[PDB]
């Protein structure tokens, strides 16, 4: 939980890591990691999930109106809460707020609320690349993209994305001793993505994990941002 994840930020700062990231939904939890040494504070909301599930519910048979409104109402409350966390962290002194979403207009509003790093996390590659281009034309400077393939991050790099997040903790969770063996096979993959991105010349490479030794090793391979993710 909290005190177990905060120990990861303290260790990276202990070992001389100058770019540490932390992901949470509570601004108080993010502020504490900010004092532990994390410079990028990532706010995440369940709003994309509620929108995805409201969209799936609309394609079912029968009366869908009361259920769709209930899901979209929760999405509004989830995003209006995340925007509050961005303001509160800005109110506290946090300089590098990040926000992840699959809707670029939610990213644009978070950018006006105080977020500096915009994380596009659209599953469709051509849908994400369009969201980058749309954010670029609005004047957004720091666009981040998340993928488990380095070639997707290089293509996103050439579209305007400055931060390239290597995330492989989504395929291991889907495939699932033994369970720890498959986790290691994914970490060996994620470390290779960072290596080739450094070879290709990627300037700002990030890496998602929850263990400081995994972020340390990805830091050895060439990761510039060590993201600590509690969820």
Residue numbers in the entry: 1 to 176, 188 to 242
Please, what does the article write about this entry?
In this work, we diversified a de novo TIM barrel by extending multiple βα‐loops using constrained hallucination. For the diversification experiment, we used the de novo TIM barrel sTIM11‐SB as the base scaffold. This variant contains a stabilizing salt bridge cluster in the lower part of the β‐barrel (Kordes et al., 2022). Here, we introduced two or three helical insertions into minimal loops in the de novo designed TIM barrel sTIM11‐SB.
Within the crystal structure of HalluTIM2‐2, the α‐helical extension at position 1 is resolved entirely; it forms multiple crystal contacts with itself. The second extension at position 3 is not involved in any crystal contacts, and one helical turn before and after the loop could not be resolved. Notably, for both crystal structures, a significant number of crystal contacts are formed within the resolved α‐helices that had been optimized with proteinMPNN. Upon comparison of the obtained crystal structures to corresponding structure predictions using ColabFold, we observed an accurate prediction for HalluTIM2‐2 with a root mean square deviation (RMSD) over all Cα atoms of about 1.2 Å but found major differences in the case of HalluTIM3‐1 as the RMSD over all Cα atoms is over 4.1 Å. In the case of HalluTIM2‐2, the theoretical scatter curves of both the crystal structure and the predicted structure are in overall agreement with the experimental data, with a χ 2 of 2.6 and 2.4, respectively. However, around 0.18 Å−1 both theoretical scatter curves diverge from the experimental data, suggesting a potential high flexibility in the extensions, which is especially conceivable for the partially resolved one. In contrast, in HalluTIM2‐2 and HalluTIM3‐1, a major pocket is formed through the introduced fragments above the C‐terminal end of the inner β‐sheet. These pockets show differences in size with pocket volumes of 1006 Å3 in HalluTIM3‐1 and 2000 Å3 in HalluTIM2‐2.
